[PDB]
């Protein structure tokens, strides 16, 4: 019943995604380097509320809003997805 | 006098222009536009509230005397906020002249019935209601006139399809004529005829 | 005396259209592309509304193209995009709007055909 | 947002016109079945009247309601005066329509229409 | 074999090399018993008991928006960033380059005309191939 | 001119193998049930899918969502792209980030292991347009193609 | 599928259903409904007919242009049967008389002609074959009509093993010889019945139910090699049925028993007409035969058809039998007949 | 020339013929397939090629105003003949 895929949607220029943009610039390479086999799909799009998608076994999905989240809270939200697995 | 060109009659153009501004001066409450065409037809464009006052003035005023309602019709122009243009074509036997009066309305707004001004308008307004769906208030007996009993929609609207939505046939099982969704053995063929080159510069619209 | 009506214009219940051809249709609002075979631009001035293409089949008797779509030939003309969108909302049609494509302005120079040192020098006339 | 009314100035006034029409349609069905010699029952006809009123229960524009009542009244006048024929009265029941399944799979089998 | 629709026969989304999303329009309907491709799989899922949660073209496009939000921004090129990170990760695993010279599959015009099922089935392309070779 | 291939070799009916192992026409209901049966007996790595070159995005997600419901992730494409490092995690890694119109803004173009004339004819046309009007410089690593 | 038989359209008059059907005996009572339902959806119908062309005119408006094709045929001429069936995908056999003529007897119409059609249809490679038999078909039946149905039903089974065989009860409809039959007895005063109609039970079935069942069998892949019993939803005592017929028609009902022997004498007297007999001895036997109960055979419900009660459609058939005084009585004015639970 | 298919059905000058197994040929049963047996492709090939002296010749199809629009045919290519695009007559430059 474990995790299969993670998607991060964010805007390139919006201030609501600044923390998410910060997280990718700083902690993405080491997180990917930690999980070499787990697809982490970062998909930018203009004027979209930043959001996290986690896909577990047999297609179950959950999404978390990251609007206004800090670089710290993004690390927390992913750390939830990578830790507890629904 | 070039043989193939329609001659221009300027005495009538001046006469119609004079009467046009005469109407506008007398009825500024309702008249929005007055124009005369290059083939000498005067059109008065009015606010819909002025249908009865304008038509009554044109019928009764001694310098108008438009006693005959030649025609009353509507035009559907979907791009407009008020899509329906209502057109009264009047004739003056006394002054051997014609005038056109135009107003507007939409799907949900009624127009005052002009039957009290011209009894000719009774069936014309029934036709406009039947074919365009424009409701006329205080009409003596408004109801479909041209379409089939129970027909749904207003065929002369531009968004009504040419072949309609239903068609009839005789069904032997129920021993009566039945109505069913329209299917055509040969679809009507749409032709794109417009040339991509401008034809009439004089009517060019600014960009 | 005027009344205050405070809802979006909806005329779907008084248009006579069947339910199938309101909810299931997809209207396209667009300015037609210029037919590439001709240089005239006079057919790219007005906005158009068309509906999604549906099945056509061959008539068994003659092989003609039969259809069951009452809207197959319906095309509407509008002055502006807003007018077309206003029409689509009150009739209850889902619609897609494609932005107008205006040719980009170009810099043309006949004298550039004879450049002293640039590649725009033409080898024939 | 100030528009000219047709009849009813607001929804409460319009709804009263709806109920007056519904009573007239409800009372007329027994005569319609008798006069047109329809094989349906008085219950079947009255159920059809309900069905036609129920499909327009989501309207909140008093003007749209007034037009529906106007068209309903005209629709009733044709029936009472026997301007309609039996074919026109029985067009409400679509007796020759083969039912069209509304589920995805049944549609998927029969064609491309959604 | 499940017969599907060609690109002229469906309203489908395609993303070009820029990442620009664009949609086709139905010009004709599929032939015979062929069906819209996403509808075949949706129909299959219901039969299999694992019904997918979208029954129309618009709904399945809402699903595309949840996976990659730019797949529904039609005619828009959404910019993509973070080349610095993609370059850092590309240096983790070293690998050798082959001694083979870089040779594209298409060297001359004859190699251009047939490259997919549609053009392979095309008699006009076959005429073109015969012409350039001969 | 390849549109005339849409009138040839077309699949117009579902097919299944008969007792002789030969393809024979059948109905959607039969063909779908036969596939539906096998899909219910397999899970995970036993079920895979390959997407060809002409597949639309609506079909691509529907097939992924279906195979994800048997806990399969083997959703593959024929065209290769290296997965090392970022792989497909970052869109910039597998896009033409300058855009087609951006070629007109470049002063140097370095082409590597490609024949844009046949791979992307209208992208090669854009390069020649810049080559001609902007005096663009072009360099190529690979087979010396015209 | 050949490309020209793949369905297209939305199921209307101009659509293509993919069915190419030869309907034998399409000019009778059941035939006009079957042809109507095939034409509605855009089927190619071949109507081989024996009668004068004027008597097929009511069939012409049932199909789009070209969809109804008429041919001549002779029940004894097997060349004329290949011509009619050799382009078809389904063959429907609806041939039958309720009387014997000088030229055709019950064996001819219910054995020799059904067998010839099936044997020729089998040779032509016709995929599907629908044969109409009778609910009460039995070898030991007192009615020779029903004895031939049993022999014919069996013969069609060996000849065309994959044939769908349908066994309807008595059918009621505008042009039936059932409800119309009872309503017409008024011309003789009382209504004679064997044992006062207290010994016979009937389960009549609506014509449209039978037609829909036939049409669903063509399309249902599981109807092949099966035998169906098309019966109505309610079983009635004959006396209750005939009394209800007279109530709906608003005609005075004067039943009186008539013994079996004396009421064959009347049947023999009506057989002398060289025209269509008003009644026959065999007709007397069939009307008084109790409808069989055959639970082992699938019914209308197994073909997606929901049987129509006699009460909904009796007025549709019997209104024309009323006098002016009663023409406008509604459906509710007559209480339903008592049923056998 | 009008041909008969192995099913016996005549082949039209447009190449149309119901293939064996096409139900649609039932429409001809007890009737006939209307086929015009003067194939225009064959008739025009029987005309002699006309030798002319000039490099350019004109064709109006004959009959002046009763023919087709007047066209002009180049005859410089000596491997082939100049054919009228309206009526199919052929022309040749004599030496
Ligand atoms: N109550 C019912 O109606 C029931 C009917 N059935 C069976 O259903 C079938 C049709 O019923 P129905 O339609 O009422 O019967 P009809 O008598 O109403 O029509 C019978 C058809 O058979 C044709 N036919 C009869 N004899 C011959 C013949 N010797 N040669 C050629 N054609 C012939 C007639 O053609 P023409 O018109 O040219 O004479 C007619 O088209 C019959 O098999 C009947 O036994 C079964 C159970 C009950
Ligand atoms: Zn010529």
Residue partners of D49: CB distance under 8 A and separation at least 6: D22, D25, D26, D29
- Cα separation of A20 and A51, whole Å? 9
In angstroms, the CA G268 to CA G246 distance is 25
Distance CA A3, CA F71 (A): 11
For residues G88 and G86, give the distance between their C-alpha atoms in angstroms, rounded to a whole number: 6
Q: Which one of B187, B195, B197 has the shortest CB-CB distance to C72?
A: B187
Both tokens assigned to D99: 């039912």
Q: Give the Å distances, CA to CA, from E40 to B70, D107, E43, E44, F9.
A: 61, 12, 5, 6, 20
The β-bridge relationship of strands C47-51 and C75-78 is antiparallel
Q: Which residues in chain B have their CB less than 8 angstroms from residue C43's CB? A: 194-196
Host domain of residue G311: 1-341
Mutate to test the pocket of ligand 1, among G22, G23, G26, G28 (most ligand atoms within 8 A of CB): G28
Report the candidate in H11, H78, H80, H72 with the shortest Cα–Cα distance to residue H41.
H11
Question: What CA–CA distance (Å, rounded) separates C91 from E40?
Answer: 31
Q: Given the structure tokens 């008597």, which residue do they identify?
A: G55
CB F141 within 8 A of CB F110: yes
Q: Look at chain G and report how many structural domains it folds into.
A: 1
Give the other-Cβ count within 10 Å of A62's Cβ.
Answer: 12
- Find the H36 Cα to ligand 2 centroid distance in Å: 23
Question: Can you tell me the distance from the alpha carbon of C14 to that of D67, in angstroms, rounded to the nearest whole number?
Answer: 7
**Distance between Cα G95 and ligand 1 center (Å):** 4
Q: Are strands G90-93 and G20-24 parallel, antiparallel or unpaired?
A: parallel
- Give the SS3 label for residue B171: strand
Residue closest via CA to ligand 1's atom 10 equals G94
Is G236 exposed, middle or buried, given 0-12, 13-18 or 19+ CB atoms closer than 10 A? buried
Q: Is D61 on the interface with B (CB under 8 A)?
A: yes
Determine contact: F131 vs chain C, CB below 8 A. yes
Interchain CB contact of H42 with G (< 8 Å): no
Q: Say which ligand is closest to the CA of G113.
A: 1
Q: How far is CA A55 from CA A40, A61, A81, F20, in A?
A: 11, 4, 9, 43
d(CA C78, CA C48): 6
CA C21 – CA G149 distance, rounded (Å): 51
CB H35 within 8 A of CB H5: no
Q: Which atom of ligand 1 is nearest to the CA of G31?
A: 13
Nearest to A51 by CA among A17, A27, A13, A12: A17
In this structure, is the dihedral angle defined by the CA atoms of residues E113, E114, E115 and E116, taken in order, positive or negative? positive
CA of G152 to the centre of ligand 1 (A): 14
Q: Do B134 and B105 contact (CB within 8 A), yes or no?
A: yes
Q: How many CB pairs under 8 A join E and F?
A: 214
- Burial status of residue B7 (CB atoms within 10 A of its CB: 0-12, 13-18, 19 or more): exposed
Residue of E121, E124, E125, E126 to mutate, testing the F interface (most F Cβ within 10 Å of its Cβ): E121
Q: Is D104's CB within 8 Å of E36's CB?
A: no
Cα angle value F134/F140/F145 (rounded, 5°) = 100
- Please judge whether H23 and G2 are an interchain contact, meaning their C-beta atoms are less than 8 angstroms apart: yes
CA atoms within 13 A on the CB side of G61: 11
Q: Which of G43, C34, E134, E38 is nearest to B194 (CA)?
A: C34
Q: What is the DSSP letter of E76?
A: -
As beta bridge partners, residue C4 has D2
Cα–Cα dist G216/G208, whole Å: 12
The Cα B52–Cα B136 span in angstroms is: 12
- Cα–Cα nearest to E63, from A7, A65, A42: A7
Distance CA F58, CA G34 (A): 43
Nearest CA residue ID for atom 17, ligand 1: G97
- Euclidean distance between CA atoms B147 and B135, whole angstroms: 16
The set of residues, in sequence order, having a beta carbon less than 8 Å from that of A42 and lying 6+ positions away, is A7, A8, A10, A24, A28, E82, F89, F90, F91
CA-closest candidate to residue G331, choices D92, D38, D87? D38
Nearest CA to ligand 1 atom 39: G51
Tokens 């390069």, residue located: F127
For the CA atoms of G327, G332, G333, G336, the dihedral, rounded to the nearest 10 degrees, stands at 120
Which chain G residue has the Cα nearest residue F25?
Answer: G1
The C-alpha atoms of residue G286 and residue D25 are separated, in whole angstroms, by 48
| 3-state SS record for chain G | CCHHHCCECCCCCCCECCCEEEEECCCCHHHHHHHHHHHHCCCEEEEEECCCHHHHHHHHHHCCCCCEEEEECECCECHHHHHHHCCCCEEEECCCCCCCCCCCCHHHHHHHHHHHHHHHHHHHCCCEEEEECCCCCCCCCCCHHHHHHHHHHHHHHHHCCCCEEEEECCEECCCCCCHHHHHHHHHHCCEEEHHHHCCCEECCEEHHHHHHHHHHHHHCHHHCCCEEEECCCCCEEHHHHHHHHHHHHCCCCCEEECCCCHHHHHHHHHCCCCCCCCCCHHHHHHHCCCCCCCCCCCCHHHHCCCCCCHHHHHHHHHHHHCCHHHCCCCHHHCCCCCECC
Q: Which of G22, G23, G30 to mutate to test the pocket of ligand 1 (most atoms within 8 A of CB)?
A: G30
Protein residues with C-beta less than 5 angstroms from the ion ligand 2 = H 59, 61, 84, 86-87
- For B43-103, the DSSP string reads EEEE-GGGHHHHHHHHHHSTTT---EEEEEEEEE-TTSSS-EEEEEEEEETTTTEEEEEEE
Report how far apart, in Å, the C-alpha atoms of G204 and of each of A75, D40, D98, G130 are. 77, 21, 24, 21
The pair of structure tokens assigned to G178 is 């059932």
Query: If you compute the radius of gyration of chain E from its CA atoms, what whole number of angstroms results?
Result: 21
Read off the DSSP letter of residue B104.
E
Question: Is C99–E25 a contact, with Cβ atoms under 8 angstroms apart?
Answer: no
Q: Which two tokens stand for residue B119?
A: 């009894």
3-state class (DSSP) for residue H59: strand
User: What is the residue whose two structure tokens read 């474990």?
Assistant: A2
> Which phi and psi (to 5°) does residue B181 adopt?
-55, 140
For residues F105 and F127, give the distance between their C-alpha atoms in angstroms, rounded to a whole number. Answer: 10
**Is F145 within 8 Å of E104 (Cβ atoms)?**
yes
CB-based contact (8 Å) between G12 and chain D?
no
The backbone region for H71, taken as left when phi is positive above 0, alpha when psi lies in -120 to 50, beta otherwise, is: beta
Query: Strands B97-105, B42-46: parallel, antiparallel or unpaired by DSSP?
Result: parallel
Q: Which of G140, G131, G87 is nearest to G110 (CA)?
A: G131
Cβ neighbours, 10 Å, residue H65? 5
Please tell me which chains touch D, using 3 or more CB pairs under 8 Å as the contact test: B, C, E, F, G
Cα separation of B66 and B86, whole Å?
18
This structure's resolution (angstroms)?
A: 2.4
Q: Which two tokens stand for residue C59?
A: 């008539």
Output helix, strand, coil percentages for chain E, rounded to the nearest 5: 40, 5, 50
CATH (residue range A3-83)? 3.40.30.10
How far, in whole angstroms, is CA G57 from its chain's centroid?
20
What is the token pair recorded at E74?
Answer: 């039609």
Residue whose token pair is 């949609």: E23
Using DSSP, state whether F133 is helix, strand or coil.
helix
CA dist G166 and G297 (Å) reads 10
Residue F109 three-state SS: strand
Non-local CB neighbours of E131 within 8 Å, separated by 6+ positions: none
Torsion of Cα atoms, B20 then B26 then B29 then B30, to 10°: -30
Distance CA C118, CA G96 (A): 95
What does the DSSP assignment read for D46-68?
HHHHHHHHHTTTT---HHHHHHH
Instruction: List, chain by chain if needed, residues with CB within 6 Å of any ligand 1 atom.
Output: G 25, 27-31, 50-51, 75, 94-97, 104, 108-109, 132, 134, 168, 170-171, 178
Which H or E element spans position C19? none
Cα G281 to Cα G266: distance, rounded to the nearest angstrom: 8
Beta carbons within 10 angstroms of residue B78's beta carbon: 18
G43 — contact with chain H (CB < 8 Å)?
no
Answer yes or no: are the C-beta atoms of G294 and G229 closer than 8 Å: yes
| Residues in CB range of G16: below 8 A, 6 or more apart | C57, C60, G5, G6, G7, G8, G9, G42
Q: Which residue of F has its CA nearest to C120?
A: F132
Distance CA B76, CA B143 (A): 20
CB contact under 8 A, F25 and G3: no
Distance H58 CA to ligand 2 centre (A): 8
Q: Return all residues near F88 (Cβ < 8 A) that are at least 6 apart.
A: A39, A41, F81, F94
Q: What is the CA radius of gyration of chain B?
A: 21
d(CA D114, CA D98): 18
**Hey, which residues does E4 pair with through a beta bridge?**
E35
DSSP string over A30-82: HHHHH-TTS-EEEEE-TT---EEEEEEGGG-EEEEE-TT--HHHHHHHHHHHH
Other beta carbons within 10 angstroms of residue H87's beta carbon come to 15
* Distance (Å, whole) CA G9 – CA F137: 58
With the C-alpha atoms ordered G75, G77, G80, G86, is the resulting torsion angle positive or negative?
A: positive
CA distance A10 to A46: 8
The ligand whose atoms approach the alpha carbon of G84 most closely is: 1
Query: Tokens 């075949």 map to which residue?
Result: E40
Q: Search chain G and give the residue with CA nearest E33.
A: G6
- Neighbour-count burial of C106, counting CB atoms closer than 10 A to its CB (0-12 exposed, 13-18 middle, 19+ buried): exposed
> Residue C17 in 3-state DSSP?
coil
E4 touches chain F (CB under 8 A): yes
Q: Are A84 and A55 in contact (CB under 8 A)?
A: no
Chain E residues with CB under 8 Å of a chain G CB are: 32-33
| Residue E111 near chain A (CB below 8 Å) | no
CA distance B124 to B118: 10
H helices within chain F, ranges in order?
A: 28-40, 57-68, 116-119, 121-133
Other Cβ atoms less than 10 A from the Cβ of D101: the count is: 10
Strands (E), chain E: 13-15, 21-23
């Amino acid at each position: 019943l474990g995790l299969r895929e993670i998607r991060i949607h964010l805007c390139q220029r919006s201030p609501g995604s600044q923390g998410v943009r910060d997280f990718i610039e700083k902690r993405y390479v080491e997180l990917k380097k930690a999980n070499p086999d787990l697809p982490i799909l970062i998909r930018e799009c203009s004027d979209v509320q930043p959001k996290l998608w986690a896909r577990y076994a047999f297609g179950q999905e959950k999404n978390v809003s990251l609007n206004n989240f800090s670089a710290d809270q993004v690390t927390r939200a992913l750390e939830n997805v990578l830790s507890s697995k629904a | 006098t070039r043989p193939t060109v329609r001659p221009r009659n300027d005495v009538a153009h001046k006469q119609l222009s004079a009467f046009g501004e005469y109407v506008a001066e007398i009825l500024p409450k309702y008249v929005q536009q007055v124009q005369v065409s290059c083939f000498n037809e005067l059109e008065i464009c009015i606010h819909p509230d002025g249908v009865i006052p304008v038509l009554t003035f044109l019928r009764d005023h001694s310098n108008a005397q438009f006693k005959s309602l030649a025609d009353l019709t509507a035009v559907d122009i979907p791009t407009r906020q008020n899509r329906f243009e209502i057109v009264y074509n009047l004739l003056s036997l006394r002054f051997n002249s014609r005038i056109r009066v135009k107003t507007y309305t939409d799907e949900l707004t009624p127009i005052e019935s002009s039957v009290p001004v011209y009894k000719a308008a009774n069936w014309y307004e029934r036709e406009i209601w039947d074919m365009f769906g424009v409701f006329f208030a205080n009409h003596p007996d408004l109801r479909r006139i041209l379409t089939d009993y129970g027909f749904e929609g207003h065929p002369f609207r531009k968004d009504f399809p040419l072949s309609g939505y239903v068609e009839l046939r005789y069904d032997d099982e129920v021993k009566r004529v039945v109505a069913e969704p329209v299917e055509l053995a040969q679809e009507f063929r749409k032709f794109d005829l417009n040339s991509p080159w401008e034809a009439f510069p004089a009517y060019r619209q600014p960009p | 005396q005027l009344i205050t009506v405070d809802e979006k214009l909806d005329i779907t219940t008084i248009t006579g259209v069947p339910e199938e051809h309101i909810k299931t249709r997809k209207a396209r609002i667009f300015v037609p592309a210029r037919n590439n075979m001709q240089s005239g631009v006079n057919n790219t001035k007005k906005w158009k509304m068309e509906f999604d293409t549906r099945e056509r089949w061959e008539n068994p008797l003659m092989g003609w193209a039969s259809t069951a779509d009452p809207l197959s030939n319906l095309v509407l003309t509008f002055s502006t995009k807003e007018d077309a969108v206003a029409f689509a909302e009150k009739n209850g049609w889902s619609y897609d709007v494609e932005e107008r494509k205006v040719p980009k302005p170009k810099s043309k120079s006949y004298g550039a055909n004879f450049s002293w040192n640039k590649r725009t020098r033409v080898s024939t006339k | 947002t100030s528009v000219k009314p047709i009849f009813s100035r607001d929804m409460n006034e319009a709804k009263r016109r709806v109920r007056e029409l519904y009573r007239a349609w409800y009372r007329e069905v027994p005569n319609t079945v008798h006069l047109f010699q329809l094989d349906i029952s008085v219950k079947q006809g009255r159920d059809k009247v309900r069905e036609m009123f129920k499909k327009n229960a989501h309207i909140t524009d008093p003007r749209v309601v007034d037009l529906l009542v106007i068209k309903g009244k005209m629709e009733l006048e044709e029936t009472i005066k026997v301007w309609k024929q039996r074919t026109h009265v029985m067009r409400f029941f679509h007796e020759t329509e083969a039912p069209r399944p509304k589920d995805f799979l049944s549609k998927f089998y029969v064609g491309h229409d959604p | 074999i499940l017969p599907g629709a060609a690109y002229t026969e469906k309203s489908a989304t395609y993303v070009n090399t820029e990442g620009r999303a664009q949609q086709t329009k139905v010009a004709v309907t599929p032939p015979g018993l062929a069906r819209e491709d996403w509808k075949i799989i949706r129909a299959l899922s219901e039969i299999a008991g694992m019904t997918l949660p979208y029954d129309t073209l618009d709904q399945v496009r809402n699903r595309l928006e949840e996976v990659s939000p730019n797949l529904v921004r039609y005619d828009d090129v959404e910019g993509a960033n973070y080349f610095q990170q993609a370059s850092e990760l590309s240096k983790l695993v070293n690998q050798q380059l082959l001694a083979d010279p870089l040779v594209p599959p298409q060297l001359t015009i004859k190699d251009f005309y047939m490259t997919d099922s549609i053009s392979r089935a095309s008699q006009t392309m076959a005429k073109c191939v015969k012409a350039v070779t001969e | 001119f390849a549109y005339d291939g849409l009138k040839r070799q077309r699949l117009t009916e579902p097919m299944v193998r008969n007792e002789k192992g030969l393809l024979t026409h059948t109905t959607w209901e039969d063909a779908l049930s036969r596939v539906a049966g096998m899909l219910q007996s397999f899970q995970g790595n036993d079920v895979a899918a390959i997407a060809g070159g002409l597949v639309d995005a609506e079909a691509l997600i529907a097939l992924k969502d279906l195979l994800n419901r048997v806990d399969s992730d083997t959703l593959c494409t024929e065209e290769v792209f290296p997965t090392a490092g970022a792989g497909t995690d970052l869109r910039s890694n597998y896009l033409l980030n300058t855009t087609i119109a951006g070629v007109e803004e470049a002063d140097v173009v370095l082409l590597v292991g490609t024949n844009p004339r046949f791979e992307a004819p209208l992208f090669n046309a854009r390069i020649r347009k810049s080559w001609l009007h902007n005096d663009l410089k072009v360099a190529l690593i690979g087979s010396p193609v015209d | 599928l050949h490309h020209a038989v793949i369905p297209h359209g939305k199921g209307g008059r101009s659509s293509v259903s993919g069915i190419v059907a030869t309907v034998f005996g399409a000019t009778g009572f059941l035939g006009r409904y079957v042809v109507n339902h095939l034409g509605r959806m855009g089927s190619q119908v071949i109507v081989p007919h024996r009668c004068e062309p004027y008597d097929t005119m009511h069939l012409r408006p049932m199909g789009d242009l070209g969809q109804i094709i008429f041919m001549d045929w002779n029940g004894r001429d097997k060349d004329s049967i290949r011509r009619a069936v050799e382009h078809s995908s389904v063959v429907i056999n609806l041939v039958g008389r309720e009387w014997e003529t000088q030229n055709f007897d019950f064996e001819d119409v219910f054995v020799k002609i059904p067998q010839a059609i099936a044997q020729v249809s089998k040779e032509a490679g016709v995929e599907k074959f629908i044969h109409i038999s009778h609910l009460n078909a039995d070898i030991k039946s007192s009615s020779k009509y029903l004895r031939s149905k049993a022999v014919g039903e069996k013969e069609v089974r060996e000849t065309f093993p994959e044939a769908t065989i349908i066994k309807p009860a008595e059918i009621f409809g505008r042009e039936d010889r059932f409800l119309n039959y009872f309503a017409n007895i008024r011309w003789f005063g009382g209504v004679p019945l064997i044992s006062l109609g207290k010994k016979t039970v009937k389960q009549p079935v609506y014509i449209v139910d039978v037609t829909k069942g036939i049409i669903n069998a063509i399309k249902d892949p599981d109807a092949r090699g099966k035998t169906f019993a098309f019966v109505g939803p309610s079983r009635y005592l004959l006396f209750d049925l005939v009394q209800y017929v007279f109530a709906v028609a608003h005609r005075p009902f004067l039943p009186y028993p008539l013994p079996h022997f004396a009421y064959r004498w009347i049947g023999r007297l009506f057989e002398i007409s060289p025209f269509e007999p008003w009644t026959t001895r065999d007709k007397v036997e069939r009307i008084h035969t109790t409808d069989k109960i055959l639970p082992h055979l699938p019914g209308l419900e197994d073909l997606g058809v929901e049987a129509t009660p006699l009460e909904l459609k009796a007025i549709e058939v019997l209104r024309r039998h009323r006098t002016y005084r009663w023409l406008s009585s509604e459906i509710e004015d007559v209480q339903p007949a008592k049923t056998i639970p | 020339g009008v041909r008969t298919s192995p099913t016996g059905e005549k082949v039209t000058h447009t190449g149309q013929v119901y293939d064996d197994g096409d139900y649609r040929k039932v429409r001809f049963v007890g009737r006939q397939k209307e086929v015009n047996e003067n194939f225009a492709i064959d008739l025009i090939a029987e005309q002699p090629v006309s030798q002319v002296g000039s490099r350019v010749i004109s064709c109006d199809g004959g009959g002046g105003a009763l023919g087709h629009p007047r066209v002009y045919i180049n005859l410089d290519k000596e491997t082939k003949t100049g054919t009228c695009g309206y009526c199919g007559l052929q022309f040749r430059q004599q030496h």
